[PDB]
Amino acid sequence: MIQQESRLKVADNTGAKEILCIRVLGGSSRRYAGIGDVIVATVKDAIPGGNVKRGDVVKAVVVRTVKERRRADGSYIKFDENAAVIIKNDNDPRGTRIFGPVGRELREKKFMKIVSLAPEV
Amino acid sequence: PKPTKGPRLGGSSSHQSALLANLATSLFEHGRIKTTEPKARALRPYAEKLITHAKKGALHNRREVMKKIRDKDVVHTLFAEIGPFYADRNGGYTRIIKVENRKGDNAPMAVIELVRE
Amino acid sequence: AVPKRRMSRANTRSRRAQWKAEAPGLVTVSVAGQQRKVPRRLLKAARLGLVDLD
Amino acid sequence: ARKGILGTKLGMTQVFDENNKVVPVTVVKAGPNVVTRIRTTERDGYSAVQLAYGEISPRKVIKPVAGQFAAAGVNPRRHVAELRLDDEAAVAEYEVGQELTAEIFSDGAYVDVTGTSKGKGFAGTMKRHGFRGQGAAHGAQAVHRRPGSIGGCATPGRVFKGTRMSGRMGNDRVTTQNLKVHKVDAENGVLLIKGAIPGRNGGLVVVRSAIKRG
Amino acid sequence: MNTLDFVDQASLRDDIPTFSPGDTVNVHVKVIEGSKERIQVFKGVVIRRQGGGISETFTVRKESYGVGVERTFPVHSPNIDHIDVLTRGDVRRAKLYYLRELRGKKAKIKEKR
RNA sequence: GUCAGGUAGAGAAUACUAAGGCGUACGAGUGAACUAUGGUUAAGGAACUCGGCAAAAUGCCCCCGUAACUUCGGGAGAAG
RNA sequence: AAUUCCUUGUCGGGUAAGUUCCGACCUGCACGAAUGGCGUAACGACUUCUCAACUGUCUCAACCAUAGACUCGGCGAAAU
RNA sequence: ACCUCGAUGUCGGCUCGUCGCAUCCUGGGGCUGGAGCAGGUCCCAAGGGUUGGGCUGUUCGCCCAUUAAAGCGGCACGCGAGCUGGGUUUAGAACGUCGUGAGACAGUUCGGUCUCUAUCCGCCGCGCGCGUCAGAAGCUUGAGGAAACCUGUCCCUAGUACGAGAGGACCGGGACGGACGAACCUCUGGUAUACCAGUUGUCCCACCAGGGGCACGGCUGGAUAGCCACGUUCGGACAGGAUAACCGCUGAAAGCAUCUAAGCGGGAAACCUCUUCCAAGACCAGGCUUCUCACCCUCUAGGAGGGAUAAGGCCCCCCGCAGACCACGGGAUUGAUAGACCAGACCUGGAAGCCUAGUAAUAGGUGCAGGGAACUGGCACUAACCGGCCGAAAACUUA
Ligand SMILES: [Mg+2]
Ligand SMILES: [Mg+2]
Ligand SMILES: [Mg+2]
Ligand SMILES: [Mg+2]
Ligand SMILES: [Mg+2]
Ligand SMILES: [Mg+2]
Ligand SMILES: [Mg+2]
Ligand SMILES: [Mg+2]
Ligand SMILES: [Mg+2]
Ligand SMILES: [Mg+2]
Ligand SMILES: [Mg+2]
Ligand SMILES: [Mg+2]
Ligand SMILES: [Mg+2]
Ligand SMILES: [Mg+2]
Ligand SMILES: [Mg+2]
Ligand SMILES: [Mg+2]
Ligand SMILES: [Mg+2]
Ligand SMILES: [Mg+2]
Ligand SMILES: [Mg+2]
Ligand SMILES: [Mg+2]
Ligand SMILES: [Mg+2]
Ligand SMILES: [Mg+2]
Ligand SMILES: [Mg+2]
Ligand SMILES: [Mg+2]
Ligand SMILES: [Mg+2]
Ligand SMILES: [Mg+2]
């Protein structure tokens, strides 16, 4: 359950450490953003000498949330750290590797690259 | 027993417990108490549970009754006299009656007793 | 707020007449050989001898 | 045409579909109903059928209703409702004394449940109409949950009858629409309505065929 | 008596081994991946078990890639096909929520010897 | 203005308590909204607000170790 | 700029976004040297901005116990 | 300066809404220098929606992300007996200017008490009395009112029509979403002041053990029930009638022509039904049914008055997830309504005693042990009582 002015750990090799969500896309006034939702965030902290730098405006798919997410089979999934992966213009994960695990909800559509790059689920 | 489900009897919390304990002590000591209607209503389940514990009292129940009643003499006389006297009664050892209201505040007053039979 | 005008006697008495009492329902009971009137709420107490009867 | 029956909300539970998907269902007791009266256009002016459900002792049954049930030719019951049909063509499908069970419905059908929502007592505006509360700090003086303004300064004068304010909510007739009936237990006379229906456990409800999806 | 038991027994699942919060268990979940139903193994420790009859559920925690993941499963869910309890657990609480802040040795659970 | 116990506490603070004094003068009930005093909260953590206002957080004893500056005393219980 | 109407003067530092904040340019309506000019380590329940934690200020509200509000018994005002 | 200086509290922001269309989007249509997508203009249309942030008191305005949009105005430039005062507009002090001066500056900065127990009308809910022409009960037609009306992305049609190419459809279907509202605890979470377990300080039960009061329930980890959203389901219709703009058919006046002068048509999120709820105090006070449909006394027989009754209602009593009181609902000896007891589900976690190992804390067997409240099935063990009040027809005219 991510919203505006929320910090998320970046899971990729792009050089970004933590990003700050600006707005949740996919609706007029969307309150929260669960697993598989795209958002516009800014790099608040980056690795010294990385590709992206602090202050940039990018897009990222909300993955590996902390709040419980209910699946279609009555099960629930939750993690311990709110993470996110920076995506490309239309749909592609910026970088060539993922570190942490991703929820199965990513498999909705167009996230096959992230599903294959994530070494879990 | 069941919570009061609303404002407690005596002021704030931590006092209704002591009030019920003293009422049950007086009941087991005398055999007939005259209190306010809601007080007796809330004491009925308390006194019945204490009487059931006394009935079942062999060991680990004396302490369960003492953790609520402080009077050692009252606990002893309860466990001795009442004891198996209600062994044939499957609950309902206390009888409640309604009496006229007292002067000043028109508080509905009741009287709790122990079924002798 | 404060009352703006003096309420008329009509409305005053109409609103005051509602502040009345309700008579209790008595019941005849034979105690001590004599018949007396006691409410049903205290009927059992009077039968057992817990209701004072002046 | 429009099937219907009276029942009692037993409770809620979960079930599993053929694809392992979870489904929260409501177990309702659509017990046997008895047709006690049929409304016609020639006698009363509208096409309806009177059903009765629930067990009641003859000593507890009142005398007027006792005589009514005697004239109808069936035993008394607790609750009596009326389902308004569409025409005499549909009314002719019922007869006085007919017994209806939960078999009138089928799995996967769409029903509408009608009941009496639970009572919330005298609830404030924030709970009645979701009124937005005021700031709990920054100086707010005893207005943390008050409604606020009510209308125009001096032009309207009155308060525009119909303004949302505080009062007693709930305990009113509610009707859900397009609830999927998951299963119809025949031996038990029970319906597993997909979703939640109004009213508490053990309360009377009336299930009917859906209008928008019947 | 669970009034709705006459409806819950039809869905109640057997062959459910007896476990308690704190024991290491690996659950097998049937997951459909693009018109292909496979079995995914999730090995963790039962941190809590909420009993409600048919709605009884259990939560399993797993530390993977330095990140903790908690997964709740209904005991009587048909999507599961195997629940193997590898080692028991010697704990005192009924819901091991305190494990959300321990890592490695500090997160290790005792074993009923 | 004078007497200043006991238990832990650096302490006449803090919690209970010994001797001592009191339940102090309108009361019994009822989970209404709402007002005031406190407690708790899934995710974000000032994004509310003119304004971190109010709330929230550390808080003590023994140690390792403390920057820019300086009037050389200090910053400093810096910080961690 | 506590001093400037033009002014949100222009450039740069920070925020994704900054009429606020800091330095510079100097066009000084209408700064200026004991009604002191320029800074100052420490200091201030003075004012302003930012950062790390923190939390119901908010997103977004929800529950629990008390003193009122509600019923009963008695006494019993008010401003207009 | 026409009411208001023997008081009309002035700019914002929060909450709360109502109304106009000179319409930001959705909807329909005409012309286009409209090839298509995408535009320019006009007409009708107010049912619905019209975002969150940084600057600045700000209104306004600029910028950052989107979305269809982030509309213009009236309601004392709406709303302070609903809320704060960031500023204006007291008393203090400072900066630059005027003034010898006290003092002033729609020039600037710091801080600077927001009172009132609702009388009447108005609004949101709940009762009492009476009426609907005998006394009561069950089910309902319904005039007349209230609630909802939002829409995005993707796939097929179709990379088709269009178009040199680029680019790229109208119409009709299918899938998934954003916001709102209704219900509910089945799942997840929030709270659980008579639930469980550990423990610091302290006093007490003569003492160990085991226990009790206070220090926010003393603090934490859980917590059955009720309520709630963060959670689970349902809805924005389908269709019918009349229309605005618009498109039309037969047609003269005026031998032609013309959508009109007589008719027939289509025509939108606008209007009325349709969807949800209230409603016969709708005084035209409704309709289909069922229970009782008969007992006395007085006034001087014209009506009236008083008493006692049938059905029924009410009071008293046990209660509710119904509730401020009320009122509603269930029961009341021909009963499981509530409390107690047993059992089950569930919460907590392994109780007291004994024995064993250890000098000791402590661990192991008796033991899914002990403790518990809301949920459920039995059980009259206790209270619904050998009990009181209201409560049924004047007649006449026509057919
Ligand atoms: Mg206490
Ligand atoms: Mg307050
Ligand atoms: Mg006003
Ligand atoms: Mg369990
Ligand atoms: Mg209260
Ligand atoms: Mg929180
Ligand atoms: Mg948290
Ligand atoms: Mg801000
Ligand atoms: Mg503060
Ligand atoms: Mg604090
Ligand atoms: Mg800021
Ligand atoms: Mg400067
Ligand atoms: Mg000067
Ligand atoms: Mg000076
Ligand atoms: Mg000073
Ligand atoms: Mg009074
Ligand atoms: Mg005047
Ligand atoms: Mg005035
Ligand atoms: Mg128009
Ligand atoms: Mg309409
Ligand atoms: Mg703002
Ligand atoms: Mg407006
Ligand atoms: Mg104004
Ligand atoms: Mg001055
Ligand atoms: Mg001068
Ligand atoms: Mg008021």
Q: Which chain B residues are within 8 Å of C48, Cβ to Cβ?
A: 97
On whether the CB atoms of residues D209 and D112 are closer than 8 A, the answer is yes
Nearest Cα of chain B lies from the Cα of C42 at a distance, in angstroms, of: 5
Nearest to C41 by CA among C30, C22, C29, C26: C26
Q: Give distance CA E104 / C1' H359 (Å).
A: 36
Q: From CA A120, how far away is CA E66, in angstroms rounded?
A: 13
Resolution reading in Å: 3.2
Positions 84-113 in D, CB within 7 angstroms of strand H: 84, 112
Q: Give the residue carrying structure tokens 């008329």.
A: C8
DSSP of chain B, one letter per residue?
A: ----SSS-SSSSTTSHHHHHHHHHHHHHHHSEEEEEHHHHHHHHHHHHHHHHHHHH-SSSSHHHHHTT---HHHHHHIIIIIGGGGTT--S--EEEEEEPPPSSS---EEEEEE---
Q: How far is CA D64 from CA B50, D37, D48, D57, D67, in A?
A: 50, 15, 21, 15, 5
**Are A and D neighbours with ≥3 CB pairs closer than 8 A?**
yes
Q: Which two tokens stand for residue A79?
A: 């993690």
Question: What is the distance between the alpha carbons of residues D179 and A112, in angstroms, rounded to a whole number?
Answer: 36
Judge whether residue B14 contacts strand G, using its CB and a 7 Å cut-off: no
Asked whether residue B96, judged by its CB, lies under 7 Å from any atom of the DNA or RNA strand H, the reply is yes
Subunits with 3+ Cβ pairs within 8 Å of B are C
Q: Give Cα D137 distance to the centre of its chain.
A: 43
Q: How far from B7 is each of B4, B101, B105, C39, CA to CA, in Å?
A: 7, 22, 19, 29
D116 CA to H227 C1' distance (Å): 18
Alpha helices, DSSP H only, in D23-146?
A: 63-72, 88-91, 125-128
Which of D11, D20, D22 is opposite residue E4, by nearest beta carbon? D11
| B86 close to B93: Cβ distance less than 8 angstroms | yes
Closest CA to B66 of B32, B24, B94: B24
A112, containing H or E segment = helix A112-117
Measured CA to CA, the distance from residue B37 to residue E22 in angstroms comes to 50
- Characterize the bridge pairing of strands A7-10 and A16-24: antiparallel
Whole-angstrom CA distances from B58 to B28, B54, B65, D11 are: 19, 8, 12, 42
- In sign, the C-alpha dihedral spanning D159, D165, D167, D172 is positive
Of the candidates A75, A79, A107, the beta carbon closest to that of E72 is on: A75
Asked if E55 and D13 count as a contact pair (C-beta separation under 8 A), the reply is yes
Residue D197 near residue D115, CB atoms below 8 Å: yes
Judged on CB neighbours under 10 Å (0-12, 13-18, 19+), D9 is buried
Q: Identify which of D24, D207, D21 has the alpha carbon closest to the alpha carbon of residue D105.
A: D207
Secondary structure in 3-state letters for C11-35: HHHHHHCCCCCCCCCEEEEEECCEE
Contacts of A101 in chain E (CB under 8 A): 64-65, 67, 69
- Describe the crossing of helices B16-30 and B37-56 by its angle, rounded to 10 degrees: 70
Query: How would you classify the pairing of strands E37-50 and A57-62?
Result: unpaired
- Residues A35, A38, A39, A42: what is their CA dihedral angle, to the nearest 10 degrees? 100
For the domain that residue A39 is a member of, what is the CATH number?
Answer: 2.40.150.20
Rounded CA-CA distance A54/A47 in Å is 9
Q: In angstroms, what separates the C-alpha of E113 from chain A's closest C-alpha?
A: 31
Instruction: Identify all chain A residues contacting E66, using CB atoms and an 8 Å cutoff.
Output: 100
How far apart (Å, rounded) are the C-alpha atoms in residues B100 and E37?
77
CA–CA dist D35, E40 (Å, integer)? 55
Which residue, among D24, D213, D11, has the nearest Cα to D112 in the 3D structure? D213
Determine the distance separating the centroid of ligand 4 and the alpha carbon of E20, expressed in angstroms.
Answer: 8
φ, ψ at E41 (rounded to 5°): -95, 130
Closest nucleotide relative to residue C39's CA, C1' based:
H316
Contacts of E47 (CB under 8 A, 6+ apart): E21, E22, E59, E60, E61, E70, E95, E96, E97, E99
CA max distance for chain A = 45
Into how many domains does chain A fold? 1
* Burial (CB count <10 Å: 0-12, 13-18, 19+), residue D181: buried
Are the C-beta atoms of residues D116 and D203 closer than 8 Å to each other? Answer: yes
Handedness of CA A11, E26, A108, E69 (dihedral sign): negative
Residues within 5 Å of ion ligand 4, judged at the Cβ atom: E 51
Pairing of strands D99-100, D204-209: unpaired
Compute the distance between CA of residue B97 and CA of residue D172 in angstroms, rounded to an integer: 39
Give the distance from residue E79's alpha carbon to the nearest chain D alpha carbon, in angstroms.
Answer: 6
CB pairs under 8 A between B and C: 18
Q: Which burial class, exposed, middle or buried, applies to A115 when counting CB atoms under 10 A from its CB (0-12, 13-18, 19+)?
A: middle
The distance in angstroms from the start CA to the end CA of chain D is 9
Q: How far apart, in Å, are the Cα atoms of D67 and each of D9, D33, D52, D73, E93?
A: 29, 19, 15, 10, 64
Of D100, D61, D95, the closest CA to residue D78 belongs to: D61
Start-to-end Cα distance in chain E: 36
Question: Residue A43 pairs with which residues in a beta bridge?
Answer: A19
| CA torsion angle D180 D181 D182 D183 (round to 10) | -170
Residue E100: partners with Cβ closer than 8 Å, 6 or more residues away = A80, E61, E68, E70
Contacts of D45 (CB under 8 A, 6+ apart): none
Domain that holds residue A76: 1-121
Domain ranges of chain C: 1-54
E57 phi, psi to nearest 5 deg = -135, 165
